[PDB]
């Protein structure tokens, strides 16, 4: 049934006129992302960049609520369709860099014991969103994001590393950072240029 299966994803790409966002078409990987994010009946989840709902679905199954920030007008009718099975998924049409996320948390997660950000970001926006969120001083357990491996390498760099630098110091100032998955090129359609990684940031 799931959005992120190659047969279902392909029928969605036929329907809304998509052809050759890089799409995850493995349900296992997406569930491992949710696993590492520790999402339960207790958990509220902010997602950024839902796409067509592949990751959104898997989070929605486990969590009390999922609030999903999406900027592109064209993806809103698709999300209404693909994620219609879920009465716990609010799609906000806003740029998360502009939002007052503190007041969105109080408005949407009164029925929740902890809050996690979980995402799969494009390269150009990754570092800014992460950094906006950590600087905004929110009440989060943590942030699990899929980004490029070469960026993870620097975000979670150990101080002894040749790659430890300002980016490392920035992220580690606010969080304990660790890569928890390597996600290869071959698990996306179309195949991206490089391997990605899933980094987990737990706040202090």
From Swiss-Prot:
One of its GO terms (cellular component) is cytosol. The keyword S-adenosyl-L-methionine applies. Disruption phenotype: No visible phenotype. Not essential. S-adenosyl-L-methionine binds at residues 22, 24, 49, 70, 95, 120. It is found in: Cytoplasm. Belongs to the class I-like SAM-binding methyltransferase superfamily. rRNA adenine N(6)-methyltransferase family. RsmA subfamily. This is Ribosomal RNA small subunit methyltransferase A. It comes from Bacillus subtilis (strain 168). The chain holds residues 3 to 211 of 292 of the full protein.
